[PDB]
Structures are given as C-alpha cells and as structure tokens.
Subunit: 393 residues, 4 copies
C-alpha cells in the first residue's frame, strides 16, 4: 500500500496533514488502480469525471481566491496535492499541474476582473480544463525567440503560427498562449504578449496527441492557428509586456512542479521497500544484505532531503519571498534525485523490475521528464549562475 509519511519532520500543520491524508485516501481509491492502464493506453478515459471529482475536493484552484470558489491556500498545499497526485500517477500529476498552476494561477495573478469572473469559476469547478502554451518547435528553451504572430487589425488581434508541446492540448477549453505582437522590437522580450484563447474559436485546431517515452496519458499536442481572430478583451496583463508574466509563471511553475519528483520518489520507495522485505534469495530476505541496505539508505536520504528543500522553499514563497535561483534549484535538485532513485528502484527489483507488469519502469520513464520539461537542467543551472552573476558585479 502507501508507506506512512513522517509529517513531524516536514513541519506541516494539522490542516496540511489532514489535506495530505484526504488526498492520499481519495487517490488510492480512484486514481491508483488506473495508473498502469493509463500508461498502457496513453489515454485517461475518465479525465473529465476525475476533474469534476477533484473540483469537488477543491484541489483545483487551491491557490485561487475564495470568491471564485477556490480554497485560497498557499503554495505549500499546492505542492502537497501535486506530490500526492504524482505519487498516484505521474501523467495525471502533470496534467493537474498544467491545469492548476499554469492556467488558474496565471489568471488570478495577471487577469482583469471580467476575465477572472468569466473563466475562473468553471476552471476551478472542473468543467473547463486549462493549459499554457509558450513553447514552439524551434523555440523550446529560447522562449523569447517564438515565431507566433499576433498582428492587430481593428479591435481584434489575428493569430497565425503554431505552438508545440502543450500539455492538456486537445482537452483544453481555456488556453493561455504567448505570441509576439511586435516582431520588430529591439529586445525580443518586448514583442511578447499573452492571450486567452478558448476552444472553438475559428482557426484554432489541434494536432494528434504525441507518443511519449513516459507521462503517457497526459495529452500533449501541437496548437495550430490560421487567421484566428482574438478579441482585444482576451489579453493577460498588458500588450507588449507578457515577458514579465512569462517569467513569473516560469518561477511558480518550477516551484510547484518540483512536487512531481517528490511524488515519484515516494512511489518508488512505497513499491521497493515491501518487496525488498518479501523477496528472498540465498536463504534470507534480499533486504538484509548490506548492498540493499545501502540502496535503501541512499533512496530514503535523497527523498527526505529533497522533500525538506521543496517544503521550506514553498513556505518561504508563501510569506512573499520568491527568488528565481531558489525556485530553479528546488526543481533541479528534485529532478536529478528522482531520476537516480527511479534507476535504483528498478535495480532493487531486478528481473521483475524490467517487465511492464511492475511499475518501476513507468516510474523511471515518468521521472526522466522533469529534467526536460519546464526548462532543462542546463537552463536551470544557467539561471542560478546568472543570479549569482547579478551580485558581485
């Protein structure tokens, strides 16, 4: 089943501990017995029903203001929920992260009153699924070099181009898309502008879902725009100032999505330790051998260290302290440790770890993503280094 989580060390209040317990129980009831089928089929059959169920719990829009139906909690609760969902299933965890943190949080931070009232209630209730589009086939890490055109004609902007790697692409009812309004600006950051593109608008179509190594079931597609007219009302923040929105979104995205590797490491431990104490070779349980004890110690220590790092940084960001380098470092460290722990878990399982009946391969394939998505490891290292360069200069 699910190993107990020592919340005394994590320094979680009673309310947060209750939230974790409720989420764990609900996910073990509903999401957990479907993870293998989701991975195999590369499709979540009950995505909308599950989204409604999550909306009933209030985890969708957990950081959204109460007036729109949100829980109005902090980022620590958000990473708790994200960690639990990723523990239950990696792909559903990624889809939930993209829906809540990327879309709802961006709306509540950089949205007009009318836009909030129009979109947030349905997104929080779970009726609408959200997504964020900033990457392009030629501009994945160099986001400011996007090629999407957002020329302005009359009172409505006309969009042409395509965006790539959009999580929840084909299923999104509300999408936040970054486009370059001013292609002739001297700094490419100035040209960027954020728009709210909703499903059904003429010219907005999506390609077929991608076939991915891991995180299968989190529908990822390519957005296609052909003379799609976006009314001026659907503009986040202000025109030609979407770079700041993009950067703040990136910081909070890294901070929240750092919860995913925590969930994957917790799942690896949950499946490894009981097996190590059940499987026996050479006349005793394989867990009694010194090498396996060392493996368990390494996995446990890495998980605990990353968990403490993420929780403390989230607590700090709740107060108001948000620095780019810390938000990069948390996810960088968590992703690397998660990949190592997943490989170690496959090794501990051994022969049975290499077949698809056991979920260790799924854990490895899911964990490999977080070193690539939301900016690769090299990008995060450069961000931290440049943050150091800002001082002592």
């Amino acid at each position: 089943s699910l190993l107990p989580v020592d919340d005394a060390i994590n320094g979680l209040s009673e309310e947060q501990r209750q939230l974790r317990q409720t989420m764990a129980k609900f996910l073990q009831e509903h999401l957990a017995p479907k993870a293998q089928e989701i991975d195999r089929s590369n499709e979540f059959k009950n995505l909308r029903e599950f989204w409604k169920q999550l909306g009933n719990l209030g985890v969708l829009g957990i950081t959204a203001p109460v007036q729109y139906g949100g829980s109005g909690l902090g980022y620590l609760e958000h990473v708790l929920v994200m960690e639990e969902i990723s523990r239950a299933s990696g792909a559903v965890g990624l889809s939930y992260g993209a829906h809540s943190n990327l879309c709802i949080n961006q709306l509540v931070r950089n949205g007009n009153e009318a836009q909030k009232e129009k979109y947030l209630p349905k997104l929080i209730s779970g009726e609408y699924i959200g997504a964020l589009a900033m990457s392009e086939p030629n501009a994945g890490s160099d986001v400011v070099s996007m090629k999407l055109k957002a020329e302005k004609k009359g009172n409505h902007y006309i969009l042409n181009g395509n965006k790539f790697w959009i999580t929840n692409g084909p299923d999104a009812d509300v999408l936040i898309v970054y486009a370059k309004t001013d292609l002739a600006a001297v700094p490419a950051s100035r040209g960027i502008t954020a728009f709210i593109v909703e499903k059904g608008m003429p010219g907005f179509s999506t390609s077929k879902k991608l076939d991915k190594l891991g995180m299968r079931g989190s529908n990822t597609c390519e957005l296609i725009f052909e003379d799609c007219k976006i009314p001026a009302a659907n503009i986040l923040g202000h025109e030609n100032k979407g770079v700041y929105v993009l950067m703040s979104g990136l910081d909070l995205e890294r901070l929240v999505l750092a919860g995913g590797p925590l969930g994957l490491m917790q799942a690896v431990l949950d499946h490894t330790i009981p097996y190590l104490h059940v499987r026996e070779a050479f006349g005793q349980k394989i867990g009694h051998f010194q090498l396996m004890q060392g493996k368990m110690a390494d996995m446990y220590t890495r998980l605990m260290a990353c968990r403490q790092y993420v929780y403390n940084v989230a607590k700090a960001c709740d107060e108001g302290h948000c620095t780019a380098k810390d938000c990069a470092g948390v996810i960088l460290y968590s992703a690397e440790c998660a990949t190592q722990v997943a490989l170690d878990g496959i090794q501990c399982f051994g022969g049975n770890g290499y077949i698809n009946d056991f979920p260790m391969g799924r854990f490895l394939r899911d964990a490999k993503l977080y070193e690539i998505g939301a900016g690769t490891s090299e990008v995060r290292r450069l961000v931290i280094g440049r943050a150091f360069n800002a001082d002592f200069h």
Copy 2:
C-alpha cells in the same frame, strides 16, 4: 549515419577491422531500418531469415571450430560482432548473443563428439536457434537454488518444473537447460546437471512472450516441463558436474555480452553528435555551448575507456588468461557507463528525446538491461570482492 570508429587506438588488426566494416555495412543495410518497428511491435518478423543471412556471413558460431562450419576466431571478433549488432538494434543484439555465446560456445566447450556433430552444423548455419536456460522464478541470482527436477528412470531422465527468463525461448530449436539431478547433495552445486533439450519433445512447452521495458523483440518466455523424458545421450559434460559448466559459461557470457553496452553507447553518440551540430538555439548550434561540450566530452571518454577495457580483456582471454573478476568487471563498468551515457543522450536531445519517434528512449530502455541480466551489478561486485578475498587469506 554511422560515425567512424578509430580502430588505430583500439589496436585492431586489419582482418578485425575488415570484419567490423563488413558487419556495419550489412547491418546498416538490413537490420538498422527495422529497429524502431521491432521495438514497437515487440516482435522480429524476419528472425529466421535474418538468422540465415547471419549464418551466410559466418558470424553465427564465429568462435566455433571450422570443421563444423564456424569461423574459428577469438572472443575479440565475437565482441566486435556483438557490439555492431547491438549498435544496429539492442534486442537483436541480445538475441544473437544468447544464440551464439550461450548455446554454441557451450556446446563446443562441453559437448561430446556426437552431440557436436548433431547440433552444431545447424546452429551455425542458422537453421536452428539456440538458447540457454538457468534462471527460475525463485532462483535468478542464486542459481544453485534452482528447483527443476531431473530424476533418472531407466536410461532417460524425466524432467519436471519450469525455467524463467529464457531469451529466444519460443523460437529456440535447441536449448541448454540446467537441472538438479541430486536434490539431496550437501552442496547444492553438486546436484546441478546440464541437459540438451530440443524443441518438440513431449512435455516441453513455452508460455507467452514477456512484455519488457526494453529489449522488446528479443522473445523471452518461460519454459514448462511436465514429465519430459530426456535421453541420457543429451547430457553436457558429466552428470552432477554441471556447476563448472555453468560457471565457465557465466564468465564467457559476461565477457561477450559486455559488447552490448559498447554498441548502445556508440549508437547514442551516433545519434547525438550530428543533432547537437544541427539543432540551434540562442542564435547558434547547441553544440557550441560549454555545457553541451562537456556532455559530449563525458560521453566520448566513457565510451572510449569502456571500449579499451573490453577489447584488452578479450584479447587476454583469447591467449588463455581468463579470470572471473576481470570478466565480471568489464561488464559491470560497461553497463553502468552505458546507462549514464543513454540518460545523457536523452538530455542532450531534450524535448525530441522524450518522444518515441527518436530512438534515445529506446537506447535508455535497452541499456538498463545489462545492469540486470547476466547477473545484477551487486552480484558482480560480490564476485570481484570474493576474488580479492581468495588472495590475502
């Protein structure tokens, strides 16, 4: 395409270099454009035709005596061919290794004249596919604790039980099976006996092929024996002395299968470097950035070091020097480095590395096996440590 391989450093004679070139050309013509389809379908459609083609080249039974149609070459040529095939496709490489090294080499080393004449010609020609069975559901690394029964009645032994994880299981026409004839021997090693079980004998049936994380297409099944009568003529070596056969086979198996990680690392480099010099971000090729240059340096140095280690140890074993600890260390080091290089290659590709259109995920999933098959990493470390314990004691 295929990057050039510096054979001047490897210290390969002209004949071996010609062998490598011929194998590379043939595999690029035939096997290479089928690797992705083999991985996706979990089945090699042209396995028997490809085996006949390999038999025409003589790579099957490359170490077998010439009188049976073999090339009569050394282990260095064997690891060369294994490396090339693994470079073309990991699963076919594993199947070839199991066919040649595990079966044909065991026959030529521990077989009677009649058994050799009966089996070797067809195995070398490619008409028959070979396999070796020593692992069981409860005895994977603790091989001496196998439960297969080999009771002797009259002049024919009767077998009951099942063996697990047999490469080339469903397709094998000749199989070498280890069974415990004397279940009451004080040392479990004494009870073990090797038998030649051929396809079609009553009571010998195979289960459905496994669904594996990687190496998909190398048909792995479970052998089922129910009152199968094996004539006494089908005994390798001598009765109750199969432990020595098993150990020598394990040593040579590790030495030859160390060529697989070399092929996988070479494939990772072949697909990574041109892409790093084609894909461009921030106004220049991504290969020009210092972090990517460091990644390339690490991958190249690890590949070269492992290649030199394997080649030198194979050359030594050709002369007659075969020590258990060296044969363990070569594959241990190669497997660990191969896994690291595969992860690094996925990272270098980035977003495109995570989709199944590009083969980086396939390389990672294939490379993870060699830390598990032919004895896990922990077993090899214990073997080396005990080899040290033998001295200074």
Copy 3:
C-alpha cells in the same frame, strides 16, 4: 567577507536569526583571523581564553538548563552555533562540538543532581573543558567490543586500559569514559558502563597529540588508565546500563555534528564566489563561463538542500521526535555533500587553490573527517537499513 545567509528560507525565528548574527560577528572578530595559523601550528594557543569568551556568550551549554547557567535552548540553536564556529574554523568547531554536545548534554541527560551541580557550572562557564571517550584502537565502529576494564573493588571502581581518538584529550578537565564492567555478560552491550573521569586522578595520563590530515588544532590524544580508582559516585546513569546512554549520545552527536559540514560548505561558498567574480581569464571573469556557472549552481543547491534537511530534523527533535535513522541520514548526506563541495571549490580556485595560502585545501581536509568521525558512512548506511528492517518484519 561573509556572504549573507537567507534565513527566510530556513524558517528561523527572529531570536535564532539574532543568535546567528551575533555568533557570526564574534567569530569574524576573534576566531576567523586565526584559522590558518591554527591549522599550520596544529595548536590553538588561546583555547582556554576563547572558551571563557564563548562561555560569556552562553553558547557553551546552550541546551543546558538555566539553573546551571545554560541558555536552555533547543538543538536548532546548537546546530546554528556549531555551523557558525565550523564556518570560522573547522578544528575549533569540532572541539566545541565535543565539549558541548558530547559532554554537557550527556551530563544533563544522564546525570545525578550532585554530579550536575558539581560539574555543569564550570563546564558551562568555560573553566573546564569536556570530552567523551568511547573509541579504542581495536574498537572504533564496533563500540560494544571495547576492552577497557572497570573492575569493582570496595566502593571505588578500578580502571585499566586505554581509549583512543579522544577529542580535547590533553586539555579536558572532565571526561566521560565508557568501560566494560561485566566482561562476561552474554550481550556485550550489558557490560558497558559510563564513568566521569576528571583530570588529575592518579593513573590517568594522556599521550601526545595526533598529527592529523585535517582538523589540525583539535587536540586528539590517547587516554591511558593504569589502576585508576574511580569512586562509585562518578557513574552516569546506572551500572551495566551504559549502552542506552551511549546510543542516545550517538544519535544526538550525529544530529548536532551535522552542523559542521554545513559550516564548511558555507565557508567554501564564501571564498569561492567572490573569487570567481574577481579572477578573469580569456578577457572576462571566470564566473561568466557556463562550466563555472554550473559549478556554482551545484554547490549552492547542495548546500541549501543539506541545510534545510538538517534544520527541519533539528526542529523535529526539539519537539520530541527523535528517530535513529533520521539522525544518521542528516549527517551522512551532509558529510558526503560537504566533501564534494570542497573538491569543487578547490577546482574552481585552480592553481591558487592548491597552495596553503588559500584555505580551500584546509576546507577539503576538514570536510573529509565527517565521513569518518562519529561513525563512518558505512555504519550510518547500515543503521538506516536496519531501521527499515525493523519494520516490515
């Protein structure tokens, strides 16, 4: 100078932040300009004066009850002070840790009222220097196999034997020594008994200080007992029950001494980052190159992660939650990361890092200890593994 420490992320209250600032200022004034001389001379000239100065601040016996003059604070403050002192100088940090945590804490936890009143005031004031003796030349990690004899004659126990590796050995006025009273007990743990041996008693002499690779200046010697008569009043806890005292002391020792690697990593960062932004090669500061930025990112992330882990575990232990495996894991992770960060700092400095004028070599040599002292890394891994074995069994 000293880089700022982000206490917002660490979740430190205002009082603890003030404590850290006061300690940093005092150490930068007094201890810091003497670290190189202490390392070179292998001797702290002003040890007693510095101990009196520390006693004035109250850091000595920071966890001791107020009635004896202690501050009566928690373990978090203790690791804060230990981290600051280790940041100023590793050897003085180790000496302070041995004086406070090993001696004073053991006295306040497992001491009679009379023993407390006799010893604690002077130890806290700084007049007396404390030390703990549990390791022997043949029993370093296997502590229960100590050979020190503690035979009982009349009302006073007579001690014969020798203890090794005692920090603050030659300078200790009060020493806590573990000896085996009952050498014939079936479990060796039962024989162990703790005694309070004070300087000047006949038969108690110390050898010459050791010449160590690092931590030079923390006087380490060998205790020699020859028919030394210890009165029965000088017994910690109860006779033949010192094993529990030893184990609790080991747990708290690991928890507090985990602060040392934090100080060493902080010092490495403090000396590395400004130099990386001052030294210039190829026409720009070496800190602007991508490889150096990656090095800085790795060092910073490792430091932050270990700091969060240690602080959260100390906070938990303050409440009352103290588990052996967590207290082992904190120091294990911290020590390994500290060694890696020290090597990285030497590399970043380059040529100047290899000379003794710069402190990078001192940082490496000091950091190597924490993987050896207070139980090696292998012992901690075994402790964590056995803690897992206790459950699921």
Copy 4:
C-alpha cells in the same frame, strides 16, 4: 609490499614487462622508504644523486635518440616509468615527468643539431635537471595571454617579466621558456616564441619554493627575469612560431602525465587491500563485509579501465596517430578516477586513514593535482568539445 600487476591484460611485450619489473624493484629499494619524509619535509634531499641513478638506468630521456645516450623507446615505456615513479612517490613522479617529457622531449622534437648536442647529453645523463615554463600569474589556462616580454636588440633577445608555477624551478639547469616576441600581433599565438634559458645567466633568478597542498617535494617556484639577454642561438623551432611547439608539448605532456594518476591508484590499492584483509571488526576481517567488497570492486575496475585506456592510447601514439582530443581525454578520465579512488581508500582505512602516519592522505593530496595541472578539467572538456565541433561544421 607491491601487489602484482597483471601485464597479460595490459598487452605488454616481454621487454616492457622487464622494464616495469626493474623500475619497481629499484624504486622499492631507493625511493619508496623516503616518500613520507619527502612529503613531510617538502624537500628531496637526494634529488641530484637520485637523478644520476635514474640516468644510469636510462629512464631519463627514455624517448630520446640513442645517439645522445637515450633509450630510443616509445611513449608506452615512458608512461610505464612515470606510473612506477608516481606509485613510489607522487612528487618525485611529477618532477621526473617535468624533467623528461617537458624538457628532453621538447628538445628532441623542436631543437637544432647544435642545441641537441649541447644540452641533451647532460640532461639524459642526469647531470642537468630540466624544466618547462609557460604559465604566468595572470595566464594559467589562457596561455596565449602571457605577459613575458622578449624584445630583440642586436643579436641577443632581452627578456623581462616573470613566470609562475615552474616545476623543478630552483633546481633546473636548463629551462624552456615561452615568451611573446611580437606583442602587437593580431593573433596572440603568433607573438609567442620559445627560448632555452640556462641557469646562471645574469638577470635570471628564482623565488622561494611554494608550500603546496600535495606533491610536496617537487620544488615549484617563480622565475624572475630582469634584462636577461638570451642569445639568438637559444631559440627552439623558429621565431614567432612557438605556438605549435607549445601545443604539441601540451598534447604529449597530457599523454605522459596521465601515467601519474595510474601510479597513485595503484598505490592506493596496494595499501588498501592488505589492510582490508588484516583489520578486523565485528569478529571478522572488514574486507568480508559487502560494502567493503563493493568499494574494492569499484576501485579495481576504475584502475583497470583507466590503465587500459592510457596504454592503448600510448600504443596508438607510438605508431604515429596523435589526436588532441584523445590525449586530453586520457588524462581527464584518469585524474577524475584517481581522485575518487583516493577518497575511497581514505574511507576504507577509516580512522587510521586520517592520520599522517599512513599515506592515504598523501595519496589524496597528490591525486588532486592532476585535475589542476597540465590544464584543468574544464579546459580538457572544452578541448574535446571543440575537437568535435571541428567536424560536422
């Protein structure tokens, strides 16, 4: 003593094996019982006598032509001798490397007939000690940015400036110095010119020897030139073409000095394994525990892999194949593995490993150099990456 070296795997001919045996015997007789004293005193008392003894064996100038008294052997023999000397003592190994490879090889490759006849006989015989000067206080890795001035007046060049980090500085009778003749050349490489500066010339003085972390005893100083007049006859190669000489020297320097880490790893194994089979804890030798067996396996495999890499690359370079990237990679891999093995050896020794009586700390401090000297690790990674960039461009 000295563990046997498996030369069957290394593929060494009988002559090379005899050379290794003779060098090992001689060094164990003379150099070995002095290593600790050399490290402690930071001075080799018998440097000149030992140099004469080495000249008698012919190891000095082993690659030099026979007509000057050299052995006329290849680079493989050179790395063999370097490895043996480094195994005996790291500092003497570095001094020998600087004397032979840096000076004598440079003379035999880029020297006039008169210069060869004047200098080589005495350098090979051991009467003169050689050294190479290319690094400066501000130009360590950016060698082309050296500031030494070599203005030409009449028929003799006048030198002003200073060079730093010169191995065998104070003891060198012949020195090869690189200076910038044309400070106004558009490429800084064109300005560089190589000179032969001999001891005793007016204006040429040396500073006090450096106090280093490791490699103590290899006298390293700073060269000081003040209006030193160098006759035009003392020019290596041709004027304003010393960049090619410098680069070829760097390549061969890396290739030969890669033998040093091999010697250090061999010494670590030689001191670790017997101790692991003598020291006993928990009622058995510490070498029998699984963790220690894993440590031994890792150390042995890393040593063997690096040894095979270096030997094969040296064999290739003997034939005529010398590529920059391979010569960089060999030393990069060897240095990193040597540092890891030294740390592991200190850990295996444990408490005794931390004192200066045992040589494990000396091995670590010596091994740390090769990641810094002869170009740091980052420089080598950049060299390999740029070598890849040259192709596919």
